[PDB]
Amino acid sequence: ASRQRKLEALIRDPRSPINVESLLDGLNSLVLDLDFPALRKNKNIDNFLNRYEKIVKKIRGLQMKAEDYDVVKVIGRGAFGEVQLVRHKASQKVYAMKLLSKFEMIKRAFFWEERDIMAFANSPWVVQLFYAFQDDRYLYMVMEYMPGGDLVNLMSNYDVPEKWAKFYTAEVVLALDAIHSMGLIHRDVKPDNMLLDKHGHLKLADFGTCMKMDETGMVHCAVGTPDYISPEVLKSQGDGFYGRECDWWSVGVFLYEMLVGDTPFYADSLVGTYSKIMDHKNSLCFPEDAEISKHAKNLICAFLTDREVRLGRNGVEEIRQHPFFKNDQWHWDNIRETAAPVVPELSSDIDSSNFDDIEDVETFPIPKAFVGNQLPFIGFTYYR
Numbered sequence: 319a320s321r322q323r324k325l326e327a328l329i330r331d332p333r334s335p336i337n338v339e340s341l342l343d344g345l346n347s348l349v350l351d352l353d354f355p356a357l358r359k360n361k362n363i364d365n366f367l368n369r370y371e372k373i374v375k376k377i378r379g380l381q382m383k384a385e386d387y388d389v390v391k392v393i394g395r396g397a398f399g400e401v402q403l404v405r406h407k408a409s410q411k412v413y414a415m416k417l418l419s420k421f422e423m424i425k426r427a428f429f430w431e432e433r434d435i436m437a438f439a440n441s442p443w444v445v446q447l448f449y450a451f452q453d454d455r456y457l458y459m460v461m462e463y464m465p466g467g468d469l470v471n472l473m474s475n476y477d478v479p480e481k482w483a484k485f486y487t488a489e490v491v492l493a494l495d496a497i498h499s500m501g502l503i504h505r506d507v508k509p510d511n512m513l514l515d516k517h518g519h520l521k522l523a524d525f526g527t528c529m530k531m532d533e534t535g536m537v538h539c540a541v542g543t544p545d546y547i548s549p550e551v552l553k554s555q556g557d558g559f560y561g562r563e564c565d566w567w568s569v570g571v572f573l574y575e576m577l578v579g580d581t582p583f584y585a586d587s588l589v590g591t592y593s594k595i596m597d598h599k600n601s602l603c604f605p606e607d608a609e610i611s612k613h614a615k616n617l618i619c620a621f622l623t624d625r626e627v628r629l630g631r632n633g634v635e636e637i638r639q640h641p642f643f644k645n646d647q648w649h650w651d652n653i654r655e656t657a658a659p660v661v662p663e664l665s666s667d668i669d670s671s672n673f674d675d676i677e678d679v680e681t682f683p684i685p686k687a688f689v690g691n692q693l694p695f696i697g698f699t700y701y702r
């Protein structure tokens with residue numbers, strides 16, 4: 319009973335590898351991976367499935383499921399799956415729910431490690447995870463809805479003045495400081511990941527790229543669209559190592575797209591984008607027509623240089639000290655409680671005006687032998 323108290327404690331700890339959610343995930347996966355007629359020929363499998371069939375159904379009904387949510391509309395669709403604006407039926411609260419195809423996911427081990435670190439850190443600069451669940455086909459992630467839309471949408475609807483770019487860059491800078499302080503490297507900082515909350519304040523979202531830094535403060539191994547990716551990250555794709563400074567390159571790309579209107583290494587092809595990024599010493603140029611302050615040009619260039627000499631290599635203090643961030647509207651300690659330059663007008667809690675309309679799927683193939691397709695997702699379920 320003393321050893322049983324110690325064992326009953328690990329299972330109660332929600333941050334434990336084997337806990338109630340993990341144990342339930344294990345039993346659900348075991349039932350799913352064995353419920354195939356070819357496998358059912360084995361008496362051990364058929365009998366286990368018979369005993370636990372009814373109870374696994376009862377348990378699946380009590381646990382959080384997709385049916386507990388009302389699908390308002392799709393606000394993003396991709397290769398992975400979609401993002402739905404949903405409302406929890408019982409609490410009546412609106413959330414953003416990403417659906418990941420388990421099948422597509424498997425074609426890419428413990429990938430939610432960084433999601434858990436970020437979820438626990440609970441930074442006001444990072445889009446919050448409330449719950450995560452799963453069914454045979456999908457992985458579900460219930461996130462805080464960011465009704466202000468992303469910075470792709472803001473950029474395509476506004477001509478961004480230096481007062482505005484000075485604010486979003488500072489918020490991205492504090493969000494990246496937060497992520498690095500968790501022992502993480504975002505890896506794919508771009509305006510699709512820059513989401514705006516109910517008041518127009520920025521938060522960084524991780525769409526599966528965040529990685530835990532090793533003892534040396536480095537990562538490895540994905541890119542997708544490269545406009546915001548540093549040369550070191552491109553060159554690593556390979557098993558190459560890079561640090562947190564790869565995220566500061568994306569801040570420079572961001573400041574450029576805000577003030578200029580186009581990405582600094584844009585091209586009609588992906589190859590050309592990749593090339594212009596690698597030859598960034600010759601290809602970086604500001605248009606004559608685009609009027610940009612000396613400090614703005616300076617800051618973009620301090621970030622868009624080789625990792626060795628890039629701004630942020632010494633720390634965040636030199637980025638904050640940069641004269642571009644001299645202003646009469648905010649401080650580095652109070653920026654999030656100051657007036658945001660673009661305040662959203664939201665008539666209802668399901669107002670999705672800042673999101674482009676989408677409106678309107680492959681699965682695992684039935685196995686002959688046990689293959690354990692559900693095994694990699696044991697522990698994904700998150701409840702707090």
Ligand SMILES: O=C(Cc1ccc(-c2n[nH]c(=O)c3ccccc23)cc1)N1CCc2ccccc21
Pocket residue numbers: 393394398401414415416418429430433445459461462463464465513523524525526
């Ligand atoms: O993608 C996500 C987590 C996430 C984070 C924010 C949002 C999100 N949140 N809020 C909004 O309003 C919104 C509007 C459009 C689009 C998205 C949103 C949705 C999912 N992860 C995290 C772990 C992981 C592994 C593998 C693959 C993916 C992901």
